[PDB]
Amino acid sequence: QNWATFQQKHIINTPIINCNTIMDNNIYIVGGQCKRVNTFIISSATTVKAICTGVINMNVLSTTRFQLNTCTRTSITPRPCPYSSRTETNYICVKCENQYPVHFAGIGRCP
Template structure:
């Protein structure tokens, strides 16, 4: 995965996330199945990108900034469109950095 895909999957251009709508997009369908969960970072791409600015190697980095997060969690195994529940929180995030760019969302609260 690269920075462009990371942005597409995790940095929406809205803070109003409707999990049942957004998770029906093709990028969240894996092997014909709805993705189990996805976390959206309610922030600018510039702020998220800054997490990796000091990463000298390709590794996981824990943000020093707390982000508003919205995690969509599949609530049942069903045909598309799959049902999702939404969980919101504010926390630090862990991202995998490659070439000083976030490329993978690795976790919430710790690496």
């Protein structure tokens, strides 16, 4: 919803993570249920923010590739839910608002 929250939800410093434990956080419980998917970007915040330079309101596909680790819910169960990890190097699509990434829209291409 804003830059500070996007950073907290998506930007990390290491590709080695336990999806089951990192997702056990209130920030990923949407509408009372554990989020289905969340992609983590292993990069400096500056580089991700730069994708939105000059963009006021639009989904933008990054020109460069980022190191990613996505946690995907394997089954809907009471919190904490189980997730599987999947790493890759790909472009990312983010929702830009007044030159700030505020939502992660997709991997590889924009919806």
